Amino acid sequence: QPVGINTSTTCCYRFINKKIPKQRLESYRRTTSSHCPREAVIFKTKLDKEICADPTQKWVQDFMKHLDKK
């Protein structure tokens, strides 16, 4: 039986280029499907805007690590 037809289909085609300070971001974090063309995580700004972030950039990994420990 084929799987992967069950993956979520929201993907990021572009990323936010410059680092966003953590004070401007909410606690929202969603990893996009591994089937997406580009590996991405979705954050949300304090104005409730979803933004695409590249998890290979250092500030993105930093913010995810911060989101981990409470």
Partner: protein
């Protein structure tokens, strides 16, 4: 260009990457264009009209270039997931 909004892509039963339907998406008041090289589907008007949650047509794969999904000849069983 604040063009870093997520967008719904189409899946396929072929086990390949999700692909944008066309090369444009609306983001924060802007008609955004996917980057050159980005994987896409180029569907006819008729194919889009009947696009549903299971494949019912052969979908032309393409590569985005300056907003056009340039077909490359590969065909896939694409479908949308709500």
């Amino acid at each position: 260009a604040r063009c870093a909004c997520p967008a719904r892509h189409l899946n396929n039963t072929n086990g390949t990457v999700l692909k944008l339907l066309g090369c444009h998406a609306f983001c924060n008041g802007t008609l955004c264009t996917a980057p050159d090289g980005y994987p896409c589907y180029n569907l006819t008007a008729q194919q889009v009209r009947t696009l549903t949650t299971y494949p019912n047509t052969s979908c032309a794969v393409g590569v985005c270039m300056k907003g056009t999904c340039v077909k490359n000849g590969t065909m896939e069983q694409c479908f949308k997931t709500p």
